């Protein structure tokens with residue numbers, strides 16, 4: 001650190017890393033970039049892949065939401081207790097990323113038309129995580145092992161935004177439901193989740209959710 | 210190990226991890242799954258995310274192509290010399306994954322219609338890697354640091370399949386071009402790349418490239 005998050009005024013792909021920071025009692029700065037400032041071109045051109053989030057950690061500059069998560073993960077000790085757990089953490093995060101991509105596709109590509117089918121296929125998309133939970137201490141702790149990993153933050157966010165998209169989509173998944181309530185109850189995380197810093201930011205940038 | 214790759218008879222998302230194994234002098238088994246065997250349902254139903262590749266390493270079973278790459282990476286010492294390089298390796302791999310996803314989209318979604326635009330936007334998509342190369346020892350060594358990382362294998366594959374899609378797409382990028390020739394020249398990798406094991410496998414599963 002110091003940590004600096006450069007992003008649009010939305011939760012989007014920074015929601016998980018923000019929860020991770022808050023949960024771990026870390027302090028950071030939010031550098032807000034408006035859509036008008038972005039259309040000016042300057043910043044976009046200076047971005048490695050021409051996109052945000054951009055993350056500053058001391059003299060280190062990173063791009064890619066999952067790179068930021070893994071960086072915080074290996075640097076803060078949220079990346080498994082050993083090499084085997086590390087692989088499982090990755091396997092979870094990759095699964096989360098795959099579904100997040102379909103979700104982002106729905107939101108910005110064809111929300112009105114595709115929402116129904118998307119929701120029909122939703123349970124098959126969530127089942128894997130319920131399964132992973134059931135194979136780890138009956139899903140009583142975290143997604144991998146008995147300690148938090150950056151994959152928890154990313155999975156938790158995925159679940160939270162899908163409950164908004166399709167309320168009760170977790171009722172059919174006992175472990176996932178209990179997992180969400182348990183994590184959301186963690187003091188610092190709970191505080192953050194209830195703060196205007198989170199609540200007053202839309203989930204996505206096109207007003208859809 | 211022993212390593213076992215369970216995948217369809219295509220290069221696809223296993224190409225990079227295969228080059229990595231070969232380049233590092235590792236031995237492994239190829240478990241081929243035909244489309245017919247897949248349509249029977251049994252295997253697919255048992256896969257965490259209902260997809261392949263599936264990777265076996267001793268009693269460890271993994272899924273997700275990038276999870277396999279990172280697993281081989283941290284286990285074989287191809288994941289940066291320190292935490293900072295590790296982050297950069299991730300940043301590179303995430304960029305590779307983003308473009309691979311658009312590539313896979315083109316190939317299986319609308320190859321005939323979208324190919325032209327895709328190719329128009331190609332240089333802007335490759336520029337970032339040329340830039341990363343230029344900022345690391347003038348691009349004389351690897352994508353990150355002076356040692357190989359799993360990101361090299363993934364980036365190399367991305368470049369190779371794009372030269373097939375749009376020949377000469379690398380002519381405008383000096384470092385990327387020299388980088389490809391240099392890596393492709395490594396003895397074991399060169400041997401592997403010239404073997405029927407690689408050559409006689411199509412790049413994708415729908416006959417398009």
Ligand SMILES: N[C@@H](CCC(=O)N[C@@H](CS)C(=O)NCC(=O)O)C(=O)O
Pocket residue numbers: 012013044050051052053063064065066303307
């Ligand atoms: N794979 C990247 C995706 C980044 C991305 O999609 N960024 C969007 C906002 S969520 C963006 O910068 N859009 C503006 C643009 O493409 O010009 C990541 O994981 O962060």
Ligand SMILES: N[C@@H](CCC(=O)N[C@@H](CS)C(=O)NCC(=O)O)C(=O)O
Pocket residue numbers: 094098221222253259260261262272273274275
């Ligand atoms: N994100 C996964 C994607 C896996 C994937 O797309 N697998 C395809 C083959 S490349 C598949 O199994 N298709 C058959 C199906 O979905 O039933 C990874 O990185 O491996």
